[PDB]
């Protein structure tokens, strides 16, 4: 049963620090301390898998793998395994192109330095790690090695014996890319080691990490390559059908491969169990995006170019949750239940006592019936209230672009709830207060709203080709005063 509490949303890439990206190092511990001192008990992150073109966490090369960019290199550099220099990284922003060019070589150099110089004790735990994680790691490491060797081409575009995973081809590829396979394995060992320490620190400080996973994996991913039967795939490995959302007047065609649920059901939903178990190592709770898919999913033929063409298909959510509940003794899922929802989807979520999402930015476009208005929140309180999501703008940016109706209805509503503001920079704080006063057990706020940043700090702008996933905190930006303001709000709203 969720405690009445508050959290902050921050993806690790946004953390401050050198070498062009936030890493699992001292700055992350600093953030946890701030979160602790501010009286927060929850840290939310976006997916932590390896990113492709477009740098999206929501399109990953592995469901299981950690992001190589989040690995801190400074512990290696202190050991003398690598020498790090700054190529001219921007501050307050991730430049992924510079990062791609510098970090991957940095990681390789570190690996070579480790293999030469590392103590045998270290080299044993790396060796022990590879054997333990082999069930996912072997394929991941090879998928990455093959990808570089095949010039970033998707696995669907690879030569056929490799694509179909014929044993001889697999064996010969591993021998040919054995140094590469070892390297990708090393990146993971570092990742899981560094996150394991970080999670330990959090737990000590009484902080639970909220993870994030998309319901659908990407087409260009190790698991899809590894287990094609699980996916609806043609002989070529091209999806016969693609994930999407029905008409959003156009609808949306995402392109993601859909699961052969029957196959998974036969298998006791093994992929999902493993996926969650791996997530639970990193996280305390796991939000699943497009959670509605578990009830039913919109199936679009791949040949069809638009979202309008497909059909709805029923999915065995009930069964999957029954298996989860029986395996873990619990269903540790936050349901992303935003957008068009059905009584069926609500039925499933409430059956497993799963908490749902609420977003305050959505709340003032309608009338008082609007579900995102606190008074309409369920009494059971199993909801996480957000000022905004990673796909939405910052609250201050939203307030600068919002309609006169929205702005007036908001001010009035706040006023009724006893919340007043004299400035637009105060608006994010007022909205944070509105969520804290609500019945919602958890209120999770992005750091950009704590800082009252404008639209320059938007994590993701849907429909914008560049500049996404790049926002970074500056060192020291999250001042003690910010923390003291949060703590006071939490005392006043009984979230301490």
Curated annotation (Swiss-Prot):
Protein name: 4-alpha-glucanotransferase
Localization in the cell: Cytoplasm
Pfam families linked to this entry: Glyco_hydro_77 (PF02446)
Native organism: Thermus thermophilus
A GO molecular-function annotation: 4-alpha-glucanotransferase activity
EC number of the protein: 2.4.1.25
Disulfide bonds listed in the record: none
Gene Ontology, cellular component aspect: cytoplasm
Keywords: Carbohydrate metabolism, Cytoplasm, Glycosyltransferase, Transferase
InterPro entries (UniProt xref): Glyco_hydro_77, Glycoside_hydrolase_SF
Upper classification of the organism: Bacteria, Thermotogati, Deinococcota, Deinococci, Thermales
GO biological process terms, semicolon-separated: carbohydrate metabolic process
Source superkingdom: Bacteria
Catalytic activity: Transfers a segment of a (1->4)-alpha-D-glucan to a new position in an acceptor, which may be glucose or a (1->4)-alpha-D-glucan
Family: Belongs to the disproportionating enzyme family.
